[PDB]
């Protein structure tokens, strides 16, 4: 139980860090009028599908 709990906390913390990184890199591009979102970051991170 303890090992599995630690594994879950590790997985969840890592995944949260990943999604936080997703935010910290993509939110600078969602608050701009022009949704460029260059396909490099568009592929590397799942792109919000900006709607021209």
């Amino acid at each position: 139980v303890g090992m599995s709990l630690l594994a879950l906390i590790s997985i969840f913390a890592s995944c949260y860090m990943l999604v936080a990184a997703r935010s910290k890199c993509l939110t600078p591009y969602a608050l701009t009028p022009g949704a460029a979102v260059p396909w490099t970051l568009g592929i590397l991170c799942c792109a919000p599908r900006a709607h021209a």
Partner: protein, 153 residues
């Protein structure tokens, strides 16, 4: 200039700022408090950013026409404001001191051709001109320019 594009934010009956409707983005200075005066715009999934201090969302398609045009090319020179004019020089925006006071922190900054170049955030008083802590659009980035010793509007 364009009345129907700058919307005020209310906080217990007090206009604490404005939210602009520019470039397919409804936007407001995140650090100003309150809720949009428009009821139709109020029920939107806004999205914050502490490091940029600009809370924005998508303009619903029912009001898309009342949106300003936007630019990133910001030549050095003179630009417009809802309190008089602003002078852009050296990566800084300068205004006659005092003109514009805390509590109107959201109003935009237009260009000679009439299209939005910046969103005011704050003031920094030094001398006969106050430097306007402003949030701008680079080609793809959004950039904060806060002069040293600025103060939040």
């Amino acid at each position: 200039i364009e009345n129907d594009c700058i919307f005020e934010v209310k906080h217990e009956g007090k206009v604490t700022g404005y939210a602009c409707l520019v470039g397919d983005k409804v936007m407001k200075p995140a650090h100003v408090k309150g809720v949009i005066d428009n009821a139709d715009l109020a029920k939107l999934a806004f999205k914050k950013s502490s490091k940029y201090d600009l809370e924005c969302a998508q303009i619903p398609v029912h009001m898309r026409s009342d949106a300003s045009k936007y630019t990133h090319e910001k030549p050095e020179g003179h630009y417009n404001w809802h309190h008089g004019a602003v002078q852009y020089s050296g990566g800084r925006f300068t205004i006659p001191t005092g003109a514009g006071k805390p509590g109107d922190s959201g109003r935009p900054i237009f260009d000679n051709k009439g299209r939005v170049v910046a969103i005011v955030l704050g003031g920094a008083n030094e001398g006969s001109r106050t430097a306007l802590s402003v949030v701008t659009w680079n080609k793809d980035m959004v950039t904060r320019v806060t002069p040293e010793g600025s103060e939040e509007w």
